[PDB]
């Protein structure tokens, strides 16, 4: 009997789901069931774990760092935290090895920011953990085995209340400035309620499919918590397994008649880029009811490519649902209409760059940007476009996207200023640029990423697009930003070995951009993969901008 995130507390939520027959299903890279976890069972393992955790003399409010793998182990640990009233803090594994020194610097800052009293990890990362917590004595380091091996602290489990902290979301900080989003039970529930009942609009019989990491915002709140608060089943792939065989995602959907799934723009592009007939041989995608896109500025153009690619296996493009969100609001902020397909608004590009206004292309329009409709505000939540000064602007005026309502965070963990402002105004400036049209939000990009030169602004992605036209360059391979000396740099990480082609493409690209944009850009060909992402899994444009700046000061 379905309930739409109805509950006060995540523990309440799960208590109800342990009464269903649904659960999670972990699949290997060949879509083979590798491990299963029923909610009924999850509740038990969570209660027991909650008591084990307490035997460690950990007090309510205390933080427990989890190494967020896509695993039955991690899920249990996470709810074990909720039930034990401890604050869960999901951390990302190492981006590999060789980046494993990058990781430790990151990890130590995470620890300085929230002082976890314990950290549960899988064996694989156990060495690394110990080698990195080298100088945090006050930290218990538990393998999942040692953790499962603990004694039930003989105590009566206290039920959590709405205003308790449920978990901290760290994707929001840099390696230099770690920021922790505080999410209370009330807040994560408000959003879960919004998503299930108002945004996505789930139905009985729906079934989710995710390949997203639990360490990112989307994967976790959208795909661990939402199937739990909705008593709906879900199937996971590992994020790395998808990266290597994209089509295994569509496979999984078609295999179990999957219904709902959401990925970033590139998740969709990766697929259509690397599909082959052998792959289309299994696929039937009529069951796919809602295909969501968000996390980064959506490319209408791509999504069209993808839909065109999979019409033949029954992908309905009307199932597309562009949506918008951030961690600072738990997850979701807006969703495109039900059964909408991608809806776009075209604008005179020059009017946007020069006058910061979204107007419709006229007879004299010479350039056009396309923005994707990301929906209207959710029930009880507000979305407002404000300018520099903090004053609300009209429709079609681009400015700072500001949000408010129950989902809003409490502030950054430890940050008094952040909590004070939110407590005072009830509004948060997301640091994203956009505008409204007939109440729908159009997200154009991050204020941080915007290329600001004399008297006009350019959207870095409009320039990077020109680079992605080349066969060798893909989306994300190219980063654009403006140096502090007002010189525009375009960095491109690529596998082009031929020295003749390098020179050829650099010269062609320079020209093509000075034609299109009236700006001369410095093409920087880098090695792959030489530019990596931020903690939220997007292109670190701003980070690359300073790396370059700091570098250039060595002159």
Residues that bind ligand 1ZZ (CB under 6 A): 171, 195, 200, 208, 217-218, 222, 226, 260, 262, 292, 294-298, 323-327, 331-332, 374, 430, 432, 443, 446, 536
Q: Which is nearer to ligand 1ZZ, 133 or 226 (CB)?
A: 226
Q: Which of 242, 234, 240, 326 is nearest to 538 (CA)?
A: 326
Judged by beta carbon, residue 149 or residue 452, the one nearer ligand 1ZZ is 452
Q: Say which residues have a Cβ less than 8 Å from residue 512's Cβ, sequence separation at least 6.
A: 466
Q: What is the distance between the alpha carbons of residues 35 and 23, in angstroms, rounded to a whole number?
A: 11
How far apart are alpha carbons 101 and 309 in whole angstroms?
A: 41
Contacts of 31 (CB under 8 A, 6+ apart): 248, 251, 252, 255
Q: Which is nearer to ligand 1ZZ, 479 or 494 (CB)?
A: 479
| 288/314 Cα distance (integer angstroms) | 9
Q: Alpha-carbon distance 232 to 361, whole Å?
A: 44
Nearer to ligand 1ZZ, 84 or 402 (CB): 402
Q: How many Å apart are CA 388 and CA 155, to the nearest integer?
A: 53
Nearer to ligand 1ZZ by Cβ, of 295 and 422: the residue is 295
In the bound state with ligand 1ZZ, the residue whose beta carbon lies nearer, of 208 and 463, is 208
Q: Compute the distance between CA of residue 507 and CA of residue 504 in angstroms, rounded to an integer.
A: 5
Both tokens of 224, joined, read: 């661990």
Residue number of the CB atom closest to ligand 1ZZ: 325
Distance CA 279, CA 44 (A): 40
| DSSP string across 470-488 | SSS--TTSEEEEE-TTS-E
* Nearest distance from C-beta of residue 543 to ligand 1ZZ, angstroms: 14
- Smallest distance from the beta carbon of 298 to ligand 1ZZ, in angstroms? 5
Q: Nearer Cβ to ligand 1ZZ, position 147 or 324?
A: 324
Q: What is the DSSP letter of 158?
A: P
* Closer to ligand 1ZZ by Cβ: residue 168 or 295: 295
Q: Which one, 47 or 296, has the nearer CB to ligand 1ZZ?
A: 296
Least Å from the CB of residue 181 to ligand 1ZZ: 8
For ligand 1ZZ, which is the closer residue by CB, 173 or 246?
Answer: 173
The two beta strands, 368-372 and 376-377, are unpaired
Bridge partners, 347 (sequence order): 369
- Find, among 67, 72, 75, the residue nearest to 125 by Cα: 67
CB of 297 to ligand 1ZZ, least distance (A): 4
Instruction: Give the shortest CB-8-to-ligand 1ZZ separation in angstroms.
Output: 20
SS3 category, 246: coil
Burial of 337: CB neighbours in 10 Å, binned 0-12, 13-18, 19+: middle
Tell me phi and psi for residue 85, to 5 degrees: 70, 15
Question: Is the CB of 49 or the CB of 199 nearer to ligand 1ZZ?
Answer: 199
Residue 552, SS3? helix
Please, what is the minimum distance in Å from the beta carbon of residue 247 to ligand 1ZZ? 21
Smallest gap from Cβ 429 to ligand 1ZZ, in A, equals 10
Quote the Cα angle for 546-549-552, to 5°: 150
CB of 421 to ligand 1ZZ, least distance (A): 17
Peptide bond into 529 cis (omega under 30): yes
Q: At residue 307, what are phi and psi to the nearest 5 degrees?
A: -65, -40
**Least distance from ligand 1ZZ to the Cβ atom of residue 436, Å:** 14
Shortest CB 398 distance to ligand 1ZZ, Å: 13
Give me the least distance between CB of 457 and ligand 1ZZ, in Å please: 16
Sign of CA pseudo-dihedral 286, 287, 289, 295: negative
């Amino acid at each position: 009997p379905m309930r739409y995130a109805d509950f006060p507390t995540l523990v309440d939520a799960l208590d109800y789901a342990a009464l269903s027959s649904a659960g999670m299903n972990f699949y290997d890279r060949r879509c083979q069931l590798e491990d299963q976890l029923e909610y009924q069972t999850l509740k038990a393992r969570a209660e027991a774990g909650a008591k084990r955790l307490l035997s460690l003399n950990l007090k309510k409010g205390d933080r427990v760092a989890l190494i967020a793998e896509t695993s039955s182990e991690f899920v249990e640990a996470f709810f074990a935290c909720q039930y034990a009233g401890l604050v869960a803090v999901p951390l990302a594994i190492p981006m590999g090895v060789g980046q494993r020194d990058s990781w430790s610097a990151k990890l130590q800052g995470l620890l300085a920011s929230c002082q976890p009293a314990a950290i549960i990890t899988g064996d694989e990362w156990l060495p690394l953990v110990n080698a990195a917590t080298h100088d945090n004595p006050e930290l218990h380091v538990l393998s999942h085995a040692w953790f499962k091996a603990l004694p039930e602290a003989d105590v009566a489990l206290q039920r959590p209340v709405p205003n308790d902290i449920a978990y901290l979301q760290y994707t929001s900080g840099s390696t230099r400035f770690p920021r922790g989003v505080i999410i209370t039970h009330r807040e994560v529930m408000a959003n879960l309620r919004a998503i299930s009942h108002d945004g996505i609009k789930l139905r009985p019989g729906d079934r989710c499919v995710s390949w997203l990491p639990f360490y990112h915002d989307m994967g976790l709140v959208g795909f661990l918590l939402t199937p739990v608060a909705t008593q709906l089943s879900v199937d996971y792939l590992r994020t790395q397994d998808f990266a290597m065989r994209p089509l295994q995602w569509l496979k999984l959907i078609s295999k179990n008649r999957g219904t709902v799934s959401v990925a970033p723009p590139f998740g969709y592009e990766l697929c259509q880029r690397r599909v082959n007939e052998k792959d289309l041989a299994e696929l039937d995608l009529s069951c796919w009811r809602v295909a969501g896109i968000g996390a980064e500025p959506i490319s209408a153009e791509q999504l069209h490519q993808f839909a065109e690619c999979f019409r033949q296996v029954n992908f309905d493009n009307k199932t597309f649902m562009p949506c918008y969100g951030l961690a600072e609001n738990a997850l979701a902020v807006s969703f495109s209409d039900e059964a909408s397909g991608v809806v776009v608004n075209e604008v005179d590009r020059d009017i946007l760059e020069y006058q910061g206004k979204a107007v419709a292309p006229g007879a004299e329009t010479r350039a056009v940007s396309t923005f994707v409709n990301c929906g209207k505000a959710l029930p009880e939540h507000g979305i407002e476009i404000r300018n520099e000064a903090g004053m609300p602007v009209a429709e079609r005026v681009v400015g700072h996207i500001c949000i408010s309502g129950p989902s809003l965070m409490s502030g950054y963990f430890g940050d008094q200023v952040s909590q004070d402002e939110i407590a005072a105004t009830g509004w948060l400036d997301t640091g994203d640029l956009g505008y409204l049209l007939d109440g729908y939000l159009y997200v154009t990009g991050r204020i941080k990423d915007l290329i600001i030169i004399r008297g006009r602004n350019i959207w870095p992605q409009d320039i990077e697009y020109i680079a992605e036209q080349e066969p060798e360059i893909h989306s994300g391979d190219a980063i654009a930003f403006v140096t502090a000396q007002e010189k525009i740099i375009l960095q491109i990480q690529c596998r082009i070995s031929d020295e003749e082609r390098r020179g050829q493409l650099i010269h062609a690209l320079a020209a093509r951009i000075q034609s299109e944009f009236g700006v001369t850009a410095a093409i920087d060909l880098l090695p792959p993969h030489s530019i990596p992402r931020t903690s939220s899994g997007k292109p670190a444009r701003a980070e690359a901008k300073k790396r370059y700046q700091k570098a250039y000061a060595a002159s």
